[PDB]
Design a binder for this molecule. Sequence first.
Ligand code: NI
Ligand code: NI
Lengths: 219, 112, 336, 335, 107, 108, 240, 333
Amino acid sequence: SCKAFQGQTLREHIEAMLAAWEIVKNKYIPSIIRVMKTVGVKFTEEDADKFMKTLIILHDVGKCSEVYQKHLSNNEPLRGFRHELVSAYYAYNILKDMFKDETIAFIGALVVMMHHEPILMGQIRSLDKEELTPEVVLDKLRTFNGVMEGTESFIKSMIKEKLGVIPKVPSPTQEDVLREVIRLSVLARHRPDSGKLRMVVGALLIPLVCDYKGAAAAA
Amino acid sequence: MYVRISGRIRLNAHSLNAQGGGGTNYIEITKTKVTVRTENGWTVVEVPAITGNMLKHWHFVGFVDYFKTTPYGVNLTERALRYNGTRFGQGETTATKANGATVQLNDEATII
Amino acid sequence: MYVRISGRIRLNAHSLNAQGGGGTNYIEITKTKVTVRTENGWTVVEVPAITGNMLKHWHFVGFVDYFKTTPYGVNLTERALRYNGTRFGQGETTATKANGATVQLNDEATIIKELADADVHGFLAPKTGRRRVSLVKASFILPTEDFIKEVEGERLITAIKHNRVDVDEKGAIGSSKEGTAQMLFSREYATGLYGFSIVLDLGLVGIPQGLPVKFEENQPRPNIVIDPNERKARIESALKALIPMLSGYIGANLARSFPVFKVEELVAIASEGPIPALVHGFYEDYIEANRSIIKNARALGFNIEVFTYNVDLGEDIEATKVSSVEELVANLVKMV
Amino acid sequence: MYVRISGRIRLNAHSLNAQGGGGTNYIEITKTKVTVRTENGWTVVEVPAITGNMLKHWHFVGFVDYFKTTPYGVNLTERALRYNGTRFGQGETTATKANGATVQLNDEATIIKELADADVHGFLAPKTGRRRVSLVKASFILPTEDFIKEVEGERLITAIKHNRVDVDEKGAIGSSKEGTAQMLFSREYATGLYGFSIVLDLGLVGIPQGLPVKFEENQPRPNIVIDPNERKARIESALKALIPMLSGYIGANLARSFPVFKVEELVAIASEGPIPALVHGFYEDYIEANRSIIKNARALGFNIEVFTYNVDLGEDIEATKVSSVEELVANLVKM
Amino acid sequence: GWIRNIGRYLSYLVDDTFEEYAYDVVDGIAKARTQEELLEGVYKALRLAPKLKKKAESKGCPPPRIPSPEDIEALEEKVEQLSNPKDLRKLAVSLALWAFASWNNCP
Amino acid sequence: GGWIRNIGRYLSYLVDDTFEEYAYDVVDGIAKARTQEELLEGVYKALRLAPKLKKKAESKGCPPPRIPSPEDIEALEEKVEQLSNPKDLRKLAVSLALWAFASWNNCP
Amino acid sequence: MDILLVCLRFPFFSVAKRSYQVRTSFLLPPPSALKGALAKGLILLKPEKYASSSLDEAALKAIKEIESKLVDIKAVSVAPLSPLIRNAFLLKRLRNLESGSNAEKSDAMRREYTFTRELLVAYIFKNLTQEEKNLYLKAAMLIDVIGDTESLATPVWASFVKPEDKKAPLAFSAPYTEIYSLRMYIEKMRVSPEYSQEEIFYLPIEERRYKRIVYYARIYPPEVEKALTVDGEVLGIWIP
Amino acid sequence: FNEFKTPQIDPIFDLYVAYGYVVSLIRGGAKEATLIPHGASYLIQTDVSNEEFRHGLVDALSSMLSLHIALAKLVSDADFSAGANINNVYWDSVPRNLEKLMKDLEKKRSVKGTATIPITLMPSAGKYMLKHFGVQGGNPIKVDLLNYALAWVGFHYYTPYIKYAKGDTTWIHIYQIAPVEEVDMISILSLKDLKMHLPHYYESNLDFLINRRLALLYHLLHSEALELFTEKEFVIHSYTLERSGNNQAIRSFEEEEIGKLMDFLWKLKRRDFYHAIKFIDDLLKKATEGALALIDAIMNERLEGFYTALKLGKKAGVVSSREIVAALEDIIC
DNA sequence: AGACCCAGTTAAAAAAAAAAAAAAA
Ligand code: NI
Ligand code: NI
């Protein structure tokens, strides 16, 4: 029930991402395993597959938020809204709900929030000088007022299409979304192992941006 | 030299110094608040008034009019004959001369 | 001579002390709160006010104007002749005189001996770091509390449009992109029964602050660096500087405003010695407070004289009903 | 002798106790925080509060002027007659006087006898010790809480920008590149119904702090180092110097601002013996609390007289109708 | 509330697309120590409003619309209890601020 | 109490569109009146230009222009007579002038 | 066992730390300041035993007598009930006390102060005699200044209250040496005046704010078995 | 657990050494830790004795020396050396102190001496302190080398500062943030992120900065104003230092103008940041009269001044978006 | 106590150069 583009269904985008992962996993999985072990959590190949599929099914979930849905309907300006941040919050919630690990949900939310890295970089470059000091002073999550219930129910079904675990993500208001996304951004920006976190988030980001150069034109 | 004049003058049927109330057509005369006791304390009442800036302009007009007849009336602003009181407006580093030239600002004595 | 004048004067249609608008055409009059009773608890309201430095600078203007006529006008700064109240500016060590001489500021005695601007109105030289407090203390002229009570409360300010009528050389009006030099603005004019108070502590004229008293032979005498004639002339000029105050010169924008003045009521005291400052002609308990102050001062045996205009004072204090300020300053300068 | 005055005074358009921004064109008057009751949490209001240091300095100024205008006032410091305030420091060990003779600071009785300014306003000589607290003290002058509550949300602060119009020798107002001093400074003024409370401990003038009494034949008697005439003259001078403060000399910028001064109400309590300080006029129900102090004044039977000005302080207790501060000081100097 | 529409219909005087630039009316509304003068200022705004409508319909841009009556009702019922000058100044300055904003006048 | 809405309705009907009779002189007279006499003349003239509005509404099919209630006139007279202060008088006159311009329910 | 309880509606005080270029003050008056004020009152009453060659040693012996009559060094306590706040005052204070540098050397020091409304001050004694109890009761008044002379003090009333041994939360100061198990404040206020030792005091006063500042008030008092009642409310004074 | 004890000196320097402690602990791990504020104690609860505290401290000190070397006797542009320090002597005392710390705390051994305390770390610091009559020949107050280094790292990394010098005069305004009830590592790292506005940002902006207050507002524009994240609200204490003619002193220790300016900025840019940034930048660039008008509307708060600023906005070609005036009205209340 | 001190200092040593993803177009 979610929509990714103005004339493209988000379910088709999800299945295209899944097919791309299924065809590039043999090439891309060992570096992911190594970096995620370097994060500090041990895991198996099936655990890595489950983690990355939960990441993929929520790569652009925030696209079916109310603001971006209205933008898809009619060309109303986004006014600085970004779907990755809501996607980061969703990824953090479902990741932490069934993995019971704080750092795994942390890295997943950070990498999913960096899916649209260069639009964010361009928005920062036009506006002030520093990047993602808290939601560019409330600008990133300003016009966002909520999401349609059915849309989120959709990804719940997507969860059922990945695994039998029930997703217990709460209804996203403004305050909780702000709190979680600020925690994520601040922890990423300032932390003694910032270099290691940047390396691992880039390693997880490479498969996410692998969706360009042909696989994005069709969608 | 120094002369101070005052007095009372009776006026009637004058729209002298009317602001206009902005761009609207209802031209309203200048009004200023004054204090009159009326045996009940110095109450404030809005009364028609005439700005002293207008008196300055009309004194300028009379001065140039009576300086035209003087044999030494050449030493006057170009706008003086124009009946324009604008002296050294926006972006004016020189003085307009009635002879058809310009005056450079170097000293107040030269200007006067 | 220590003198203190105060009183209440009607005033209207004056643009004194414009705030300047902060760069906008609509320049507004300076206003201050007055905290009027309004028949109940103290309620504050902001009404037009006249700054104290306005009064001090116009006293300086009258002072220099009266030195212009008097023979003892050579011992003055040429900056004063420019109607400029600046003492020495900033970053300036040596000052210039009216005759064109240069005076060093290192020693205060040298400044005081051949000057009066730095004596009557004080001075501050940051370069030398030498400061002398003025003998002229000027209060703020505010509409009285009873006036506010009887007018309840308004803005007390009228906005009047003023325009420039500049045209080009041909006699035409266009936009500023071609060279038009006319431009709009507006002015604020105020009114009310204002009240003023001025203190001339003119007992330190010609007296340096570093060594105020000599005590060479162990007896009290002021350290006057000038002859008594010059000091007397300076005192007379300073007192005569009050003549414009009650007639036509208090504020600024005199060319277009020329604030309208009349001596509604006045009271001045002098004793050639330390005296209480008069309560401002602003407060409700004004005349009673003045009567009590004068009767208490005269009950102590002091040789204080008080002169009142358009007020009965206390119908028992020996104070002659004066006629104007000219004879007031005349008697205050011929009393010694 | 021992005097405690307090009350309410309404002041308008005064730049007393400024800061100047530390060297900026904008001059910042003192602004403090006052906590008051508004039945929705103890609210805090930013309102100016005039310090007691200005009151002490103006008492100093009036005192030195009254000695200047008094033939009996000779023992004064020439570097303190310029309203300096500073009297002694560790860098010097000799007191300088307006005459050609100095004071050797080897003892405390000698400095008490030979300098009245060091008596009334105290002094401090770290080189030779022998400190002496200032006899006259003053409190901070801030608007009363009842007035702030009844004026609800208000800051009581206004600023008027003044300027200097200095012009060089040439008849033209130049820029900063020419050397002119045509520049603005924003003087910040204040209004409101301030409260004052000042203590005058004039019972120790000419009385050394170390030995207030002699006690040789075991009878109570003050140790007056000087003759009673000089002590009486000092009392008269101090009570007369209180007059400029209560009349027109409060704060700073007097030559420019001259705060419009008139006492709205005043309560004073005077006695020969020490008396507790009267409650500051800031509080709402302090006048009745003042009566409590009167009860304390009646706790041990003190010969205390109370002067009222635009107040009653009850009816059962004795009071004195005073029409102006000069009448109050006349009553004080009567005894 | 009821500030959006009054600000939108008051900003037309100072708007660039209208070459009359009634700065004086907005100046009078802005710093008004008493209610009567800010009321006079908004009255002058409403009096110039037909001129703005006429020039808008002559140029081609959509004509401005008179403020809704409920806005006037709210303004009248709020202006009466302006016992303290502070709230009156707050309202006048808020109106002046909303008189300076960007609006979609001529597409 | 009550005079506000009815005065607004009538003054709008006098000033609003779909009438081609735009009388602003009466509105200016009501507004700029330091004394009460000229405010009364202005409101009287506004009330007098009732038959024109009624005839035009009947001719062009517009709803009839409602006339202010007599109690509204009562309240007007009481507050004009009981308020000798020019301040409140000016406030009332300018309030009426403000209510002269209102976008009420015009002709469909 | 009696407690000398005094009410003073003083506006301000200034008691700074080892501070220079600024004088930040304590939130509550220190015991040393209270003892000095009481010694000043005693001297003002009658210098029959406080009069001697020098004022310094006279004050020293007065403070010694006060400490002797008090139970211990950290005995006198202070407790506010009104919200007190800390503000800043810039005054030109002379700094001639430095090495040389003439005597008129003055700089604009930020001599900040603490505003308040009303505080209670309790003195602990050792069953002093009736004559001495009256002398101290009349010495409880005459507190005409607290801290520096720029800010004065004014007592309202004085009383002799009893501990009455009732369990209630406390509000007065207490040393932190013995109070460990008890929103909490703690600093050093130099309980021993210096006239030419190591301890830390605790205060049950929090920070709070209004917009961006701190106005100090009291919340969540600890539990102490020793407390009394006065003026309709309940206060608590620690007893060694 | 260890319950790291912290001595009590003053709730400015003590909060600085607490910031040093917490940053050293968060550097290198220290999970399941908290900061308990006790008015002035500011203690830490962490389950470690001493491994990662050393690791984080040495990492932070290495970063300190690297930044000092990169910035430019051994004067540099570093915040802990000359970016906030007002004394020229500090510009040479800091390098030698850091070199001594490097020579001391690198071979797993404790410190052996002490050091002086500066005005920036503690405004109540000075070589002249009176005891009964006068001052001593030295300075009785001393700070341990470890405490000094932790205070330095907390000052440079956590508390923000605004620097503006006009030819001879130099102004530095440091506004430290303190808790009231409780904080956490999320709050600590948020406060670390609050540290911005690198020392040297002056290329041409001074041409319109002129007034100190205007420069302070412009530099606070690029700062951050969000504190509701931490689940606990904070407080700010600001102190200023001036140097006119090489004379350094204190003229402001507890002043509200920084606080009210910060609140006004937070309540203005909450409804947008792009339009607010554009508006403030344009008025600072060309509508200098509007900038002074806005500062006069904040300093000595008067609402009408805002309008005049908006007036100059039309003189500056500002877009004047819909949400800016809504935020201003919300500020008006 | 007392001195100062507070910003530009300028001979052979070592590598060469295109996306299409969606922002207040
Ligand atoms: Ni995406
Ligand atoms: Ni994608």
